[PDB]
Amino acid sequence: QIDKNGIIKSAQLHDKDVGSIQVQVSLLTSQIKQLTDHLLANKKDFISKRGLYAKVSKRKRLLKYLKHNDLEAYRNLVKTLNLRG
Amino acid sequence: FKRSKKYCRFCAIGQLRIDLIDDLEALKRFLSPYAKINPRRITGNCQMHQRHVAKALKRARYLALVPFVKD
Amino acid sequence: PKIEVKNDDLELALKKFKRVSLEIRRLAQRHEYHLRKGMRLREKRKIAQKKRRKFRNMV
Amino acid sequence: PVVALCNTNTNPELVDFIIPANNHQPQSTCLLMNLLADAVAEAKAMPTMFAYKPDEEIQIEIPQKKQITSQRLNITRNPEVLTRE
Amino acid sequence: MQYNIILLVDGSLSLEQANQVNEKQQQTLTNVEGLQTEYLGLKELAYPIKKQLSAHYYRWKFSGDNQSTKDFKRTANINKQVLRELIINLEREYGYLASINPKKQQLALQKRAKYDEIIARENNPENPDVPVTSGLASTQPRLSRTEKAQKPKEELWDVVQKMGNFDSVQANPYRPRFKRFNAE
Amino acid sequence: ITTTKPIKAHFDPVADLLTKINNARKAKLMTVTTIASKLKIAILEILVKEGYLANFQVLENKSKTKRIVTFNLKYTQRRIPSINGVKQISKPGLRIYRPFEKLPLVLNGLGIAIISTSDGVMTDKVARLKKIGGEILAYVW
RNA sequence: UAUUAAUCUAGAGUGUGGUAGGGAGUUUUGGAAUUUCAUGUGGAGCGGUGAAAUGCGUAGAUAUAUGAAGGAACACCAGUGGCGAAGGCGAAAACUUAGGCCAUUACUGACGCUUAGGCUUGAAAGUGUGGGGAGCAAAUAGGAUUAGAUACCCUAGUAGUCCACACCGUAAACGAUAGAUACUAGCUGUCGGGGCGAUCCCCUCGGUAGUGAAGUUAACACAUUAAGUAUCUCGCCUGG
RNA sequence: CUGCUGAUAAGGUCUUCAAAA
Ligand SMILES: [Mg+2]
Ligand SMILES: [Mg+2]
Ligand SMILES: [Mg+2]
Ligand SMILES: [Mg+2]
Ligand SMILES: [Mg+2]
Ligand SMILES: [Mg+2]
Ligand SMILES: [Mg+2]
Ligand SMILES: [Mg+2]
Ligand SMILES: [Mg+2]
Ligand SMILES: [Mg+2]
Ligand SMILES: [Mg+2]
Ligand SMILES: [Mg+2]
Ligand SMILES: [Mg+2]
Ligand SMILES: [Mg+2]
Ligand SMILES: [Zn+2]
């Protein structure tokens, strides 16, 4: 499993902030990487594929919201995460 | 006649964890005279403890601690 | 399914062997003809329901 | 008009003059029935029996055949209706 | 993680099988914490496996990373001296979080005390235990529950606007319809 | 006033109140509560003025962040309500706009029609008197 | 109502703390039973049926005891049950991994519901390549029954059923009931978390069942897990 | 306690009526 504490402490905009959109999408990207690794390894686990698709869609919706509101933070988040491509 | 003394022993003990090398003689009571897992009506445990006991007893039977078909 | 005669009497041995043979014959006849998985599940549930209702009315 | 001694299991709509009361106690039912009969007997003019009376004349006994048990039992004679195929 | 190995070794001679277990321990278990070992003993196992009737049982209570199992698992079958072996990861057993939970442990100890007291009263030495109250129901409900019962979060609201409040109170349902009998 | 149960409400403010009122009427229930919105507050004010409810009462949390409105129905002595039915017109999606010329008359004037023209919600008769119309929320008779 | 500029937590998520599961994939392991083969004892039948006959058998069958090989499925536990979105999931273990329930003085601050088009999965049968083949058995052969039997019964029996990789994308794929949200009597069980602390039982929050009034229905019936009071969105119907 | 057991040309009456006693 991933070090959620480390990911949150890296992605926090300030202290005690553990549920912002930026920390949520950073956690989502980490889980996306882990699930892509697992799915490429296995290739016949379809529940994991469903979970991966759900997480991808949730990340996309969160990024759409963060682009609609406070777009400068969206540019910041995208250039730190390099998730677009 | 019959009896109403059927209660989950592990519920009263509050054992909360089953290990096959801590109450080995306890599981032999649950096992049938022909080495089968007795149902709830005879065994007396609740569903959670019955499931735990069944898994532990099957693990022991794999480990060759109690037979399969004979006494 | 060993039952000891105990050499004290014989009718007792047959009285227990009748049961042991009955619950043995149940599974012996169950594993005789091939039914689908769903039909086998239906038969198991039907037997369980019959036993449950009999015990409810006898208790 | 219909009056009745409702006992917590009756439909209040059907009865006009509801009398919240017991129906299982042979002393309570006797007391209330005799009270209604006392109303009738006073209207048709004989001496009363229980109404407008002191304790020494209201007192009653408990029929034969610690405290009295107004407990409803014998739920075991309510099996599932004959079904199954 | 926290693992638990149950090793089953051929019953030739106790010191030699102790050496066998020590070698099997020191060979595999790449990354490991302290490896405490027990000795269940020589037992006449139920069914004959590997054409043997007696076997030494050991239990290993080591703990370590997920890679600690592969070499041991692939070497146990190769070793002719080991009949079987079971790596039971206790972190996945049927109830482990409850076992680590501290409050449940103390509660279990209290249950132990009370149940032992009840069983002693039932198996009184020679005087006759009239109640024989073990499987039956208990006495009146627990005053401890009756007192320490939880209180829901009753969120308090402050009145701002009101209109039409008079509190008439019309709690006379099923009132009699007929009033007085009369003649034409 | 203190409460114990959580309070939820539908996203549609007119039909939420209408469903609450209709269910309370059918089940003979007297007091009901819901989340407070200003449209609902005004509509309940006009219902109380027209005499279809006993009282409506708004309340606010201790932190002044949440408001809930609780109202009671007006039952007679024999326990039969004054409301006979409710039907919502301007549902979400299809909003109903009618000028003064087509302002409806509910049940030949026995019931009332709730119209929120320009000065908050407004009864059909007073809307006719003011010669101006607008959004038509619900029919209550 | 829509647009814009902002605030708030009650919808929805995230974090911490409790926690139940046959949820999924990959790799190893185990025991009953059938079959075949090997080795002993034994001597006329075994098998099969409504009744028999094909068939197997003095080249020693059926039976009995021991051993070996290989394949497929995992008794009892097993339920007036659990998990998943559906198909579906039940011998043991490890590794990887998905979702859910309860309590939150924490955080973001409407980020939500539905979803044409698109993508993903989808019982069994079927296809292609390579493996595997114990049992069962479409097609096929024979013996019966029959007026006939290309069927029901029996004896054999190939594909298939099994694994890996690619397709097919249909089912009475059913709760014959799309999803989400708010409200509306009660009674009896059962499963999980939490509160008390022997079990049992009590309370709270949820899952899954039975009975049942208002209410709905053409009737059967549904009935807080609605087919009730209403809203939103999608799909679908218009006589045989 | 389960053998076997297949078929039956076409079209058709029959309610006149309650006004009422
Ligand atoms: Mg079939
Ligand atoms: Mg609004
Ligand atoms: Mg053999
Ligand atoms: Mg297939
Ligand atoms: Mg032929
Ligand atoms: Mg026939
Ligand atoms: Mg055959
Ligand atoms: Mg072919
Ligand atoms: Mg179809
Ligand atoms: Mg199905
Ligand atoms: Mg019903
Ligand atoms: Mg047509
Ligand atoms: Mg014949
Ligand atoms: Mg003909
Ligand atoms: Zn228990």
Nearest-angstrom CA–CA distance, F137 and F106: 13
Residue pair F77/E172 in contact by the 8 Å Cβ criterion: yes
Q: CA of D56, closest CA in chain E: separation in Å? A: 33
Task: Give the closest residue to E155 by CA, choosing from D62, F5, C23.
Answer: F5
Nearest-angstrom CA–CA distance, B41 and B8: 11
Structure tokens belonging to residue F27: 């089940």
Q: Which structural technique was applied?
A: cryo-EM
Residue pair D50/D36 in contact by the 8 Å Cβ criterion: no
Cα F90 off chain centre by: 13
Nearest-angstrom CA–CA distance, A35 and D18: 70
Is the alpha carbon torsion for F24, F30, F35, F41 positive or negative? positive
- The tokens 């003809």 sit on which residue? C33
Task: Give the closest residue to F7 by CA, choosing from F35, F30, F29, F28.
Answer: F35
CA distances from E52 to B4, B45, D84, E56, E57 (A): 44, 35, 53, 11, 14
Structure tokens belonging to residue D52: 């407008």
Identity of the residue numbered E37: T
DSSP state of E75: H
Residue pair E40/E52 in contact by the 8 Å Cβ criterion: no
Find the closest chain E residue to F58 by CA distance: E161
Pairing of strands D3-4, D17-18: parallel
DSSP state of E142: P
C-alpha of residue F49 to centroid of ligand 5, in Å: 94
Nearest-angstrom CA–CA distance, F64 and E160: 11
Residue pair A36/A83 in contact by the 8 Å Cβ criterion: no
Residue pair D30/D46 in contact by the 8 Å Cβ criterion: no
A with C: 3 or more CB pairs under 8 Å?
Answer: no
Identity of the residue numbered D48: T
Residue pair E122/E134 in contact by the 8 Å Cβ criterion: yes
Whether A84 CB is under 7 Å from strand G: no
Helices (H), E56-157: 70-76, 97-100, 102-122, 143-148
Nearest-angstrom CA–CA distance, C7 and B55: 39
- DSSP assignments along chain D, one per residue: --EE---SSS-TTT-SEE----SS-HHHHHHHHHHHHHHHHHHTTS--SSTT--HHHH-----------------TT-PPPS---
Q: What is the dihedral of CA D49, D50, D53, D59, to 10 degrees?
A: 110
Nearest-angstrom CA–CA distance, F128 and F115: 11
Structure tokens belonging to residue D85: 């195929």
Which residue(s) pair with F56 in the sheet? E163, F71
C-alpha of residue C38 to centroid of ligand 10, in Å: 9
Establish how many alpha carbons lie within 13 A of residue A62's alpha carbon, considering only the half-sphere containing its beta carbon: 21
Task: Give the closest residue to A29 by CA, choosing from F134, A21, E152.
Answer: A21
Instruction: Please judge whether B64 and E49 are an interchain contact, meaning their C-beta atoms are less than 8 angstroms apart.
Output: yes
Indicate the fold that domain E4-88 takes in CATH: Alpha-Beta Plaits (3.30.70)
Find the closest chain E residue to F66 by CA distance: E157
- The tokens 């926290």 sit on which residue? E2
DSSP state of F109: G
B: neighbours with 3+ CB pairs under 8 Å?
C, E
Residue F38 buriedness (CB in 10 A; 0-12 / 13-18 / 19+)? exposed
Whether F6 CB is under 7 Å from strand G: yes
Residue A50 buriedness (CB in 10 A; 0-12 / 13-18 / 19+)? exposed
Nearest-angstrom CA–CA distance, E49 and E77: 13
Which residue(s) pair with B37 in the sheet? B31
Nearest-angstrom CA–CA distance, E76 and E79: 5
Q: How many domains does chain A have?
A: 1
The residues, ordered by sequence, that sit 6+ positions from D38 with a Cβ below 8 Å of its Cβ are: D48, D49, D50, D51, D52
Q: CA of C36, closest CA in chain D: separation in Å? A: 19
Structure tokens belonging to residue F100: 């003064």
Within 8 A of D17 by CB-CB distance, chain E residues are 176
Task: Give the closest residue to E90 by CA, choosing from E181, E2, E179.
Answer: E2
Structure tokens belonging to residue E161: 């606007």
Identity of the residue numbered E66: N
The residues, ordered by sequence, that sit 6+ positions from B26 with a Cβ below 8 Å of its Cβ are: B9
Nearest-angstrom CA–CA distance, D3 and E7: 83
Task: Give the closest residue to E137 by CA, choosing from B4, B2, B41, B47.
Answer: B4
Nearest-angstrom CA–CA distance, E115 and F77: 59
Structure tokens belonging to residue D57: 């004349």
Is the alpha carbon torsion for B50, B51, B52, B53 positive or negative? positive
Whether A42 CB is under 7 Å from strand G: yes
> A47 CA to G100 C1', in Å?
14
Is the alpha carbon torsion for B41, B43, B49, B54 positive or negative? negative
DSSP state of E125: S
Is the alpha carbon torsion for F55, F61, F64, F65 positive or negative? negative
Whether B45 CB is under 7 Å from strand G: no
Radius of gyration of chain D (CA): 18
Structure tokens belonging to residue E23: 């070698």
Is the alpha carbon torsion for A23, A26, A28, A30 positive or negative? negative
Residue C27 buriedness (CB in 10 A; 0-12 / 13-18 / 19+)? exposed
Structure tokens belonging to residue E5: 């190995």
Nearest residue to G200 via alpha carbon and C1'? E137
Nearest-angstrom CA–CA distance, F39 and F42: 5
Residue D52 buriedness (CB in 10 A; 0-12 / 13-18 / 19+)? exposed
The residues, ordered by sequence, that sit 6+ positions from F48 with a Cβ below 8 Å of its Cβ are: E163, E164, F55, F56
Range of the domain at A41: 1-83
- Strand order, beta sheet including F86-88: F86-88, F135-140, F112-116, F121-123
Beta strands in chain F (DSSP E): 31-35, 53-61, 67-73, 86-88, 112-116, 121-123, 135-140
Nearest-angstrom CA–CA distance, F84 and F52: 10
Nearest-angstrom CA–CA distance, D30 and C21: 62
Helix A46-68 vs helix A71-81: crossing angle, to nearest 10: 140
Residue pair E176/D3 in contact by the 8 Å Cβ criterion: no
Phi-psi map region of C42: left, alpha, beta (phi>0 left; psi -120 to 50 alpha): alpha
